[PDB]
Structures are given as C-alpha cells and as structure tokens.
Amino acid sequence: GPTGTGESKCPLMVKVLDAVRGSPAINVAVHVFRKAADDTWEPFASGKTSESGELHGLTTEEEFVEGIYKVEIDTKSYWKALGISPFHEHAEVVFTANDSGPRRYTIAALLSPYSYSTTAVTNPKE
Amino acid sequence: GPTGTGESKCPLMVKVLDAVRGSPAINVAVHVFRKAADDTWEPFASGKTSESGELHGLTTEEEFVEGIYKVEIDTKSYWKALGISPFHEHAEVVFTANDSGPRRYTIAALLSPYSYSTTAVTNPKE
Amino acid sequence: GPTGTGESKCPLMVKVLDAVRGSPAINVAVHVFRKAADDTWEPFASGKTSESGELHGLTTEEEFVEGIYKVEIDTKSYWKALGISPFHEHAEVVFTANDSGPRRYTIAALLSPYSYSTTAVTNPKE
Amino acid sequence: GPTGTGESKCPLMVKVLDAVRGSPAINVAVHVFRKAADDTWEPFASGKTSESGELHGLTTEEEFVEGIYKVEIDTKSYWKALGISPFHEHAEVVFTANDSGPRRYTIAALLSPYSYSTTAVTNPKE
C-alpha cells in the first residue's frame, strides 16, 4: 500500500480525502513521474492509499533528486467503484522539487465527483 | 425571478455550485444579516437561488452601507432534497463591507456534503 | 496551545493550513460553542493551533454530548499579523454532533485571504 | 477580445479566479489539447483570460467532438507576474467529452500560490 521506490525521512507523501463521504479516500492508485532528460515523463514510483487515505514510502531522500515531478491520482477508478460517473479522468499535480529549499512534500487532495482541490506541504516532514 | 430586496446595479451577489452533480445549486435559501449596534444580527435581505444558481437584487447601493454582514446559506435542506446526508447545518460568510474597497461583491459557494469553499469579490461588474 | 476543556480519545480536532505559504497555520485562535437550551451559543472550549496547525485536547468524550456546535476560526487575526487585509471576519463551521453514529471529528480548514474551504472527518480518531 | 479558436454557442468555457486578491485571474494563458489516436496531446485551442477572468470562443460545436481533453492553465507565470513564489508548474484538467452528457462546459479554476480547485459543468447556457 503506502510504499514505493524508497524509504527515508519521507520526502514525498500523498493524502486523499473524500468530500462526499467525509472520510479518507482508501485504495486510490497514485503514479509518480519524473521529467526525463529527453523531456518525457519517466515512471518514478507508485502505490495506493491506505485506510488513512495516505501514501508513504514512495521514495527516498537519495533517489528524490531535483526535477519536475508529476503526481497522478486515479480519481476516476475511485468514483467508479463507488457507483459514480465522475467528471475528471484523474487529478495531476506538477511541480519542481529542488535541493535549494523545501525538501519534504505532502501533496493533499480533496475529492468530489465534479471537483477537486490540491494543496502542498509543511517543512521538515511533520 | 430569484431576487432579494432591491433591484439595480448589484453591490452584492451570491452564486452557489454543486460539486457532486457539476451544476448550479438551484433553489437554495440564502439569508443576509447585518450586525446591529448591540452586535445582534438583524435580517437584511433573503432569497432562493435561480436555475443558474445565482441570487441578485438582494439590496441596493444606497442601502448597502459599511458594516459587518453575514450571508447564511441553507446547505442542509439542499442535500436533504437530494437524499444525501450532509455534515454542515449551513454555510456562513461573515465580512466587513468597506467603502474605500470594491463596490461589487460576488460571494461564491461550492458545495459538497462534507465540504465547502467560499470565495469573494471583483469590482466593475459582470 | 492544542488543548481545551477536556482530554480523551480526541472526539474533536481542528487542523488549519495556509494556502498562500504552503504550511500549517500556526497560532490561529479557535472558539467552540455549543447551542444552548435557550437557543443561544454557550462557550464550550478554545485554544490555538500548534506549529503543526493542529488543535487537540479541546474536549473530552464525556463532555462532548449531542448538540449543535459552532467552531469559529479567527482567520482575520491570522492574516493581519501576516501583513494582509483579508476578506472574511472569521471562518465558522456549524454542525450537529450526536451519539448515534460518528463520534470523533476532524474539522480541517485551508486558508486564502479571499477564500477558504472546510471539510470534516474520518471515523474512530485516526 | 479574449477568445480561443471558433466563435458561437460555447460548448467549452474557462474561468480562473485569484483567491489571494479576490478578483479574476486576468491574462492567464490556457492551452487546450485533445488526445490523439497514439495517445499524444494534439493542440486544440488556446487563449488568455480577459479582464473578467474568462476565455470564450475556444472551439465550436461541430469541432468539439467526443474524446479526451486536457485544459492546461499557466498558473506559474501568473504568480510570477505578481511576485509570489508558487508551488505548481501549472494546473491541468483532463476529462472525457461525452455527447449523451451535457453540451456546455465551464471549467472553473480558483488559484492560490500553493493550492488550487477546479470544478466543472452545467448545461443550457449562462
């Protein structure tokens, strides 16, 4: 579940919440990509949210180098399973991650069938 | 149609959206209040949103004086009518109307059974 | 800080996030009221968010009986201190809390100077 | 003024709001894409939001066929222009345009340096 391509002080964590039910979004698949040298998206890490709606251990401090990363949340499969025909195919969060500043990231996403918000971070990890 | 009290160049407008169905929240009750000297809420204007999810002609420029206002939105009757169990009793937006600031105010509300956003203002008009 | 009128399995917790800075909202004063028998708001508990943007220990399982509670977040003082003139006087969350179902509550609030969202819960506590 | 490609009864419209200043996001670049057979994104329509934060006449009913669309919003250049350091590279909305569904689509985006919401649809018109 909440795991991926690494284990460290958790430089990248994802938390998904369900705005219709008032609970975390469990079993939401997440795919992380890194912008490759040839400008394409290279697959970086993936997992699914736990019963807490969280995704941990996706990567590691060493592996998480500067770059443009795309965090893709499969919202569609999530609503489908619930009996709902959602509007979005998925929710994507694209950002630059460096060395030069903030180096631990909490990407949060609040889900509604026709809407979603996404917000980012704190500082060290907690 | 769906109007409040006074009709003319709208200094205050309300718009409500349904994030579950992806459409405007139609026929929603909104009640506006002004804090009186003894700090109690005196009814100011009221109305129900139209088929477009908007409420206009609530008040007028001469009537809308500086002060503290409360826009209360009956969110619960809305979800009940749809058969979804909601969390909130209602949504509220409390703000100070200040002359040296913008004249026109659009209070936007995006609704979910367990969550809501509220955003405000602009200046010239539509 | 994150404390109030009780200590238990945390039936009521509050977390505030800053959407402009990407961090938790620290030192945000929170006031909780309970609808009184005579239909007025009786003060119930209060505190301020910690460095994590969270508020714990506000109440206790025994003290937190069925009722309509109003959670008031002093967003205005928060932005003022930051050098910003916000739009809202505060952010309020009004809901019924029972015995008959969900009995642990996490009220979260994401803050912007002219906007704010609020969402509620999970189930047991975590 | 601020238009995309084809002009007439708008099957797709975009509106962007600034949650920091409480006004429309003016002069924002939006690029629309259609997934092609080989699953690559082919440019479909583009434009900059007007003084009202809207983008109209992007396409036309005859042109807007069923398929998967991507609306990319240049959020970063927006915050840079204001001098605020943002988190996201840009905002994206990926969705399937399906005939048996509504015809008109308004993609609404509410922006903050570290957070964004996106909501959709209605049906008849304005």
XYZ file of C-alpha atoms in Angstrom:
504
model
C 0.000 0.000 0.000
C 1.601 3.273 1.223
C 5.039 2.445 -0.198
C 7.025 2.831 -3.409
C 10.565 3.120 -4.749
C 12.215 4.114 -1.464
C 12.329 4.534 2.310
C 13.703 7.581 4.174
C 12.505 10.632 6.159
C 9.595 10.670 3.681
C 10.479 13.405 1.218
C 7.148 12.825 -0.577
C 3.794 11.859 0.992
C 0.255 11.865 -0.539
C -3.105 12.162 1.383
C -6.501 11.831 -0.322
C -9.851 12.787 1.265
C -13.403 12.123 0.075
C -15.640 15.230 0.253
C -18.869 13.307 -0.399
C -18.443 10.810 2.480
C -16.269 12.721 4.867
C -13.536 10.151 5.053
C -10.160 9.423 3.632
C -10.109 8.008 0.102
C -8.882 4.403 0.533
C -7.256 2.380 -2.284
C -6.621 5.298 -4.601
C -3.800 4.397 -7.005
C -1.070 7.038 -7.359
C 1.636 7.250 -10.041
C 4.621 9.497 -9.791
C 6.674 10.506 -12.783
C 9.816 12.493 -13.179
C 10.539 14.673 -16.190
C 13.194 12.836 -18.143
C 16.236 14.357 -19.859
C 14.574 13.902 -23.275
C 11.566 15.822 -21.951
C 9.352 12.754 -21.494
C 7.797 11.529 -18.228
C 9.791 8.646 -16.744
C 7.832 6.455 -14.265
C 9.205 7.179 -10.772
C 7.101 5.446 -8.066
C 3.520 4.216 -7.438
C 1.274 2.850 -4.739
C -2.209 3.050 -3.293
C -3.573 4.992 -0.353
C -4.086 3.174 2.882
C -7.167 3.089 5.088
C -5.990 6.505 6.294
C -6.020 7.910 2.776
C -2.264 8.282 2.927
C 0.646 7.181 0.803
C 4.111 6.846 2.439
C 7.466 5.339 1.463
C 7.044 6.233 -2.200
C 10.626 7.353 -2.452
C 13.850 8.078 -0.606
C 15.951 11.175 0.092
C 18.781 9.912 -2.103
C 16.518 8.998 -5.028
C 14.431 12.159 -4.870
C 16.785 14.497 -6.814
C 15.935 17.975 -8.225
C 13.407 17.771 -11.077
C 9.844 18.286 -12.318
C 7.604 15.586 -10.977
C 4.049 14.736 -11.879
C 1.856 13.166 -9.215
C -1.121 11.456 -10.846
C -4.094 10.427 -8.727
C -6.553 7.948 -10.247
C -9.732 9.621 -9.124
C -11.856 8.054 -11.873
C -11.365 4.451 -10.730
C -12.117 5.634 -7.233
C -15.551 7.089 -8.068
C -16.425 4.305 -10.500
C -16.083 1.745 -7.756
C -18.435 3.903 -5.645
C -21.161 3.820 -8.318
C -20.447 7.349 -9.549
C -19.585 8.651 -13.031
C -17.030 11.378 -12.232
C -16.018 14.295 -14.416
C -12.165 14.133 -14.354
C -10.042 11.313 -15.812
C -7.570 11.849 -12.937
C -6.016 14.560 -10.826
C -2.421 15.627 -11.637
C -0.052 17.798 -9.556
C 3.053 19.039 -11.370
C 5.823 20.831 -9.559
C 9.569 21.375 -9.385
C 11.343 19.770 -6.452
C 14.842 21.015 -5.640
C 17.639 20.795 -3.072
C 17.712 24.578 -2.707
C 14.966 24.897 -0.099
C 11.920 22.754 0.852
C 12.749 19.109 0.539
C 9.875 17.192 2.164
C 6.442 17.296 0.444
C 2.862 16.499 1.464
C 0.529 16.648 -1.552
C -3.068 16.576 -0.287
C -6.182 16.114 -2.451
C -9.859 16.589 -1.529
C -12.211 14.774 -3.928
C -15.733 15.456 -5.221
C -17.212 13.832 -8.378
C -17.183 17.153 -10.329
C -14.458 18.919 -8.419
C -11.148 18.612 -6.579
C -8.624 20.772 -4.704
C -4.983 20.076 -4.147
C -2.608 21.775 -1.781
C 1.049 21.266 -0.905
C 3.364 20.914 2.131
C 4.813 21.884 5.538
C 8.654 21.848 6.048
C 10.821 19.018 7.576
C 8.259 16.173 7.429
C 5.910 16.952 10.336
C -37.256 35.766 -10.735
C -34.790 34.838 -7.941
C -34.090 38.208 -6.324
C -33.610 39.569 -2.798
C -34.898 43.036 -1.873
C -33.783 45.972 -4.034
C -33.169 45.838 -7.797
C -30.459 47.757 -9.713
C -26.627 47.802 -10.080
C -25.914 44.858 -7.736
C -23.483 45.652 -4.940
C -23.839 42.087 -3.562
C -24.497 38.815 -5.426
C -24.414 35.160 -4.374
C -23.716 32.116 -6.536
C -23.835 28.533 -5.299
C -22.424 25.431 -7.084
C -22.928 21.676 -6.545
C -19.635 19.783 -6.707
C -21.374 16.353 -6.706
C -23.517 16.896 -9.777
C -21.464 19.557 -11.540
C -24.269 22.094 -11.817
C -25.530 25.202 -10.006
C -27.243 24.705 -6.619
C -30.821 25.566 -7.610
C -33.441 26.861 -5.194
C -31.131 27.322 -2.250
C -32.224 29.594 0.585
C -29.838 32.409 1.454
C -30.456 34.895 4.256
C -28.317 38.041 4.656
C -27.798 39.806 8.004
C -26.274 42.994 9.274
C -24.693 43.214 12.744
C -26.640 45.801 14.686
C -25.253 48.146 17.388
C -25.906 45.628 20.154
C -23.998 43.194 17.959
C -27.042 41.134 17.061
C -27.917 40.012 13.552
C -30.735 41.987 12.006
C -32.375 40.453 8.873
C -31.229 42.391 5.845
C -32.240 40.505 2.655
C -33.178 36.973 1.566
C -33.864 34.862 -1.483
C -33.547 31.483 -3.214
C -31.020 30.785 -5.960
C -32.357 30.527 -9.509
C -31.910 27.843 -12.153
C -28.469 29.424 -12.691
C -27.513 29.127 -9.028
C -27.457 32.902 -8.573
C -29.216 35.403 -6.270
C -29.470 39.034 -7.452
C -31.203 42.264 -6.428
C -30.676 41.429 -2.760
C -30.100 45.090 -1.873
C -29.185 48.421 -3.407
C -26.197 50.777 -3.293
C -27.920 53.353 -1.138
C -28.996 50.603 1.321
C -25.731 48.606 1.418
C -23.783 50.646 3.955
C -20.450 49.904 5.556
C -20.703 47.389 8.343
C -20.429 43.712 9.122
C -22.529 41.297 7.061
C -23.475 37.644 7.368
C -24.549 35.565 4.387
C -26.075 32.338 5.568
C -26.678 29.583 3.047
C -29.126 26.742 3.783
C -26.904 23.898 2.609
C -28.590 21.120 4.607
C -32.087 21.422 3.066
C -30.269 21.288 -0.266
C -28.571 17.955 0.370
C -31.688 16.573 2.091
C -33.710 17.303 -1.015
C -31.162 15.243 -2.968
C -31.187 12.470 -0.357
C -27.559 12.795 0.726
C -26.666 13.033 4.404
C -24.685 16.250 4.945
C -22.337 17.351 7.672
C -22.948 21.088 7.998
C -26.016 22.745 9.374
C -25.463 25.626 6.902
C -22.660 27.656 5.332
C -21.801 31.165 6.578
C -19.780 34.022 5.216
C -19.076 36.928 7.611
C -17.335 40.027 6.174
C -16.958 43.795 6.563
C -18.283 45.917 3.712
C -15.846 48.816 3.439
C -16.438 51.804 1.105
C -12.828 52.527 0.174
C -12.778 48.965 -1.094
C -14.527 47.407 -4.145
C -18.214 48.081 -4.642
C -19.463 44.869 -6.238
C -19.228 41.572 -4.256
C -19.955 38.106 -5.606
C -19.890 35.537 -2.778
C -19.256 32.199 -4.476
C -20.006 28.949 -2.697
C -19.018 25.418 -3.943
C -20.847 22.676 -2.064
C -20.180 19.041 -1.121
C -21.987 17.004 1.564
C -18.902 17.181 3.794
C -17.099 20.150 2.499
C -17.475 23.680 1.172
C -15.452 26.523 -0.286
C -16.374 30.156 -0.304
C -14.665 32.827 -2.301
C -15.317 36.548 -2.891
C -15.178 39.819 -4.905
C -14.181 41.680 -8.094
C -15.125 45.326 -8.842
C -16.588 46.756 -12.097
C -19.389 44.278 -12.877
C -20.110 41.130 -14.939
C -1.881 25.551 22.688
C -3.661 22.470 21.234
C -5.807 21.905 24.332
C -9.143 22.976 25.789
C -11.911 21.853 28.132
C -11.045 18.145 28.113
C -8.791 15.168 27.415
C -9.902 11.837 25.892
C -9.698 9.858 22.616
C -9.993 13.279 20.934
C -13.610 13.495 19.846
C -12.895 16.899 18.246
C -9.684 18.018 16.492
C -9.019 21.114 14.291
C -6.274 21.481 11.570
C -5.605 24.757 9.733
C -3.461 25.102 6.580
C -2.184 28.221 4.817
C -2.731 28.119 1.024
C -0.541 31.163 0.328
C 2.596 29.815 2.075
C 2.090 26.104 1.853
C 2.342 25.452 5.543
C 0.169 24.881 8.527
C -1.443 27.981 10.030
C 0.279 28.402 13.428
C -1.268 30.340 16.347
C -4.771 30.518 14.940
C -7.243 31.043 17.797
C -10.275 28.727 17.759
C -13.502 29.078 19.764
C -16.028 26.335 20.110
C -19.598 26.964 21.133
C -22.490 24.706 21.855
C -26.089 25.631 21.129
C -27.653 26.290 24.500
C -31.124 25.233 25.657
C -32.375 28.831 25.293
C -31.112 28.795 21.702
C -28.020 30.916 22.386
C -24.384 29.894 21.822
C -22.725 28.835 25.081
C -18.884 28.993 25.046
C -17.594 25.396 25.010
C -13.787 25.290 24.516
C -10.952 27.326 22.918
C -7.287 27.160 22.063
C -4.749 27.981 19.388
C -3.200 25.839 16.689
C 0.247 24.490 17.264
C 3.263 24.645 14.974
C 1.596 21.759 13.131
C -1.550 23.781 12.526
C -3.461 21.418 14.770
C -5.675 21.768 17.797
C -6.050 18.767 20.175
C -7.476 18.192 23.655
C -10.244 20.742 23.176
C -12.764 18.475 24.807
C -13.475 15.037 26.224
C -15.750 12.128 25.300
C -17.883 12.638 28.400
C -18.256 16.397 27.903
C -18.917 16.204 24.176
C -22.670 15.375 24.302
C -25.163 15.506 21.374
C -25.757 19.079 20.172
C -25.170 21.776 17.549
C -21.675 23.122 17.837
C -20.098 26.108 16.171
C -16.368 26.017 15.503
C -15.078 29.549 14.943
C -11.643 30.080 13.424
C -10.097 33.544 13.759
C -8.749 33.847 10.257
C -8.704 37.657 10.308
C -6.149 37.973 13.119
C -4.093 35.382 11.316
C -3.821 37.340 8.045
C -3.480 40.700 9.785
C -0.359 39.522 11.537
C 0.985 38.452 8.118
C 0.539 41.959 6.673
C -2.612 41.060 4.738
C -6.105 42.597 4.805
C -8.322 39.507 4.444
C -11.917 39.377 3.275
C -13.636 37.236 5.984
C -14.059 38.221 9.649
C -13.608 34.530 10.569
C -14.452 31.052 9.381
C -17.325 29.206 11.129
C -18.277 25.506 10.887
C -21.688 24.596 12.304
C -22.804 21.017 12.642
C -24.791 18.575 14.751
C -22.767 16.080 16.750
C -24.599 13.036 18.103
C -24.087 9.685 19.830
C -25.997 7.886 17.080
C -23.098 7.400 14.672
C -19.790 9.262 14.059
C -18.357 10.465 17.310
C -14.806 11.650 16.565
C -14.374 14.785 14.388
C -11.519 16.364 12.427
C -12.514 19.809 11.121
C -9.892 20.933 8.590
C -9.596 24.435 7.096
C -7.473 25.638 4.156
C -6.943 29.420 4.189
C -6.504 32.066 1.478
C -7.011 35.834 2.056
C -10.203 35.926 -0.099
C -11.215 32.311 0.216
C -11.393 29.238 2.442
C -12.552 25.604 2.339
C -13.537 23.433 5.231
C -14.034 19.709 5.302
C -14.917 17.222 8.030
C -13.785 13.854 9.470
C -12.727 10.178 9.317
C -14.209 7.669 11.869
C -12.634 6.459 15.201
C -9.907 9.126 15.562
C -7.254 8.019 13.050
C -11.262 40.122 -27.133
C -10.044 37.073 -25.142
C -11.179 34.172 -27.324
C -9.795 30.799 -28.429
C -10.495 29.479 -31.937
C -14.134 29.268 -33.052
C -16.892 31.715 -32.073
C -20.562 30.833 -31.404
C -22.676 28.934 -28.806
C -19.788 27.992 -26.475
C -19.516 24.279 -25.762
C -16.418 24.885 -23.578
C -15.524 27.902 -21.409
C -12.806 28.534 -18.823
C -12.893 30.919 -15.868
C -9.993 31.499 -13.494
C -10.136 33.234 -10.062
C -7.425 34.607 -7.736
C -8.056 33.626 -4.117
C -5.296 35.954 -2.793
C -6.642 39.176 -4.252
C -10.309 38.258 -4.585
C -10.570 39.030 -8.288
C -10.485 37.191 -11.627
C -7.099 35.882 -12.841
C -6.530 38.269 -15.758
C -4.368 37.468 -18.768
C -3.751 33.849 -17.912
C -2.588 31.500 -20.655
C -4.727 28.419 -21.203
C -3.934 25.744 -23.777
C -6.455 23.011 -24.676
C -5.436 19.586 -26.026
C -7.099 16.548 -27.477
C -5.643 13.050 -27.003
C -4.848 11.706 -30.440
C -5.007 8.035 -31.548
C -1.417 7.383 -30.500
C -2.450 8.872 -27.168
C -0.437 12.046 -27.609
C -1.754 15.534 -26.947
C -2.549 17.458 -30.092
C -3.013 21.264 -29.692
C -6.692 22.059 -29.953
C -7.300 25.694 -28.865
C -5.604 28.407 -26.792
C -6.147 31.845 -25.338
C -5.573 34.261 -22.449
C -8.248 35.118 -19.896
C -9.854 38.554 -20.168
C -10.347 41.287 -17.584
C -13.250 39.126 -16.347
C -11.073 36.041 -15.942
C -12.909 34.187 -18.709
C -11.912 32.509 -22.002
C -14.623 32.078 -24.670
C -14.911 31.028 -28.316
C -12.222 28.393 -27.809
C -13.952 25.978 -30.196
C -17.294 25.267 -31.812
C -19.975 22.578 -31.526
C -19.136 20.958 -34.832
C -15.420 20.858 -33.862
C -15.804 19.745 -30.218
C -16.174 16.001 -30.705
C -16.280 13.260 -28.116
C -12.869 12.367 -26.803
C -10.413 13.099 -24.039
C -9.440 16.730 -23.440
C -6.732 18.480 -21.459
C -7.060 22.072 -20.299
C -3.721 23.343 -19.126
C -3.587 26.603 -17.213
C -0.321 28.563 -16.888
C -0.587 29.294 -13.173
C 3.128 29.882 -12.537
C 3.600 32.845 -14.924
C 0.555 34.304 -13.185
C 2.036 34.206 -9.693
C 5.469 35.247 -11.004
C 3.938 38.353 -12.512
C 2.550 39.159 -9.052
C 5.878 38.368 -7.375
C 4.682 35.417 -5.300
C 6.600 32.146 -5.328
C 4.209 29.371 -6.401
C 4.302 25.635 -5.958
C 2.721 24.265 -9.131
C 4.195 24.328 -12.577
C 0.647 24.680 -13.994
C -2.897 23.449 -13.386
C -4.436 20.675 -15.515
C -7.928 19.404 -16.063
C -8.280 16.119 -18.001
C -11.824 14.965 -18.903
C -13.854 12.983 -21.440
C -16.330 14.963 -23.524
C -19.310 12.650 -23.956
C -22.275 13.501 -26.240
C -25.043 11.869 -24.216
C -23.926 14.171 -21.432
C -24.269 17.987 -21.098
C -23.209 20.149 -24.013
C -21.884 23.280 -22.319
C -18.813 23.008 -20.007
C -17.432 25.766 -17.807
C -14.115 24.687 -16.245
C -13.694 26.886 -13.176
C -10.312 27.295 -11.538
C -9.648 29.043 -8.147
C -5.965 29.784 -7.619
C -3.612 30.158 -4.640
C 0.209 30.021 -4.710
C 0.131 26.600 -3.035
C -3.273 25.359 -3.820
C -5.966 25.141 -6.477
C -9.515 23.945 -7.001
C -11.121 23.041 -10.265
C -14.786 22.481 -10.808
C -16.957 21.807 -13.883
C -20.215 21.902 -15.919
C -23.888 22.930 -16.205
C -25.982 22.563 -19.402
C -28.276 25.188 -21.025
C -26.066 28.304 -21.012
C -25.346 31.453 -18.951
